[PDB]
């Protein structure tokens, strides 16, 4: 008809809000990772690098067992040593970049604990179903 | 296309149902004729206009469903 325009919901422009709003727009960003004589080799190498990075990410997600979904809970408890704060402030005041800058130091130990809990769980489930 | 299938929450399966209702606007017909006589190619040719409209509905339906059930499992 006449009068109605066209509205999008696009790229990272939603990266200046609290935690709650931004999480509503994850999917689009996740979709924009695999879009698509001395110079051809360069672009070919770049494409190969991008594919390798994507596969690395996919495997690293697969190991934890939360594959096939955008959100996933886990059993590791949260040590208060890192940043006490409290839930309401964390979810209604800060932006993503500030949080990332805030939790840059203790990154690897969390991955280690996640991996360990996942492994113990699958082993327990495996012998458990071995009993049945 | 693997990723595109993955987004719609039907990974690892060759068949998958979903909640979006079927509007009669696109093509009324009826079950018997479509599942008996029509072939694949002609069907594709005849529904070649309303693909992009369809994809977004599935996407948003999955997103809303997952967000809703997250709270239910959270209060558990």
């Amino acid at each position: 008809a006449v009068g109605i325009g066209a509205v999008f919901l696009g790229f990272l422009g939603a990266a200046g809000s609290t935690m709650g709003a931004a999480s509503m727009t994850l999917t689009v960003q996740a979709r924009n990772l695999l879009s698509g004589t001395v110079w051809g080799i360069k672009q070919l190498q770049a494409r190969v690098l991008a594919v390798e990075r994507y596969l690395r990410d996919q495997q690293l997600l697969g190991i934890w067992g939360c594959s096939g979904k955008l959100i996933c809970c886990t059993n590791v408890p949260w040590n208060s040593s890192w940043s006490n704060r409290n839930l309401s402030e964390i979810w209604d005041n800060m932006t993503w970049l500030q949080w990332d800058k805030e939790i840059s130091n203790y990154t690897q130990i969390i991955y280690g604990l996640l991996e360990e809990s996942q492994n113990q769980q699958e082993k327990n489930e495996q012998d458990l179903l071995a009993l049945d | 296309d693997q990723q595109l299938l993955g987004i719609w929450g039907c990974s690892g399966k060759l068949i998958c149902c979903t909640n979006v209702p079927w509007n009669s606007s696109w093509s009324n017909r009826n079950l018997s004729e479509i599942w008996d006589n029509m072939t694949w190619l002609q069907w594709d040719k005849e529904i070649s206009n309303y693909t992009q409209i369809i994809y977004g509905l599935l996407e948003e339906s999955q997103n809303q469903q997952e967000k809703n059930e997250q709270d239910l499992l959270a209060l558990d």
Partner: antibody
Amino acid sequence: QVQVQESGPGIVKPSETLSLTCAASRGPFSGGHFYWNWFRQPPGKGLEWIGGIYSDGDAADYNPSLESRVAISRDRSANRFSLKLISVTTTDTAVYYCSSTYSWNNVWFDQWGQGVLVTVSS
Amino acid sequence: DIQLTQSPSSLSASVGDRVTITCRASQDINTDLSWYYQKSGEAPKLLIYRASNLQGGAPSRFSGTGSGTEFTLTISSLQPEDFITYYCQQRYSFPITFGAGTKVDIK
């Protein structure tokens, strides 16, 4: 999700110039077109469309009857839009509204705010 | 300008009744038509779009149909709030027109 408010004088003498203004927001959406519209309704009769303008252009479109007595402007710094009306008369005494209509895929939303009264008297 | 005629101009029935209103266009407008509902002391809010796309949040008792130069709205059961003003209008090329409107009353 957008709120809208109106701003203008309460009483203006006949034949003077009436200036009205209305603000707007962009909501969670990132980029698109918001066809802003100005509507009116006199008491005790049907509504009537005054005019429209895109949020990314300046070719303000007016109804054929009141082409000569309407001017529409937009301000990007203030993200506002204003209307000027000349040769005011007692008939213009009415409730006026600024509205926007989204353009999402096959939904056709619409907001209407609250509007404001305008009275012409001596 | 495309002229739209509403019928009945006024009506009065009891609560819980089934009623029907009609809006006739002066010419063929296809299906780019929508009805807005409004009450005293409030700005209008859209009721139905295209006469075949139910607006979210509306009660299901309202149904809309029609085509060409004739469109119809049927209410299965009256409610105290249903006694309100309605306006059929056309979202077509310029200009833009709106109906006279109909008021439902208690009897």
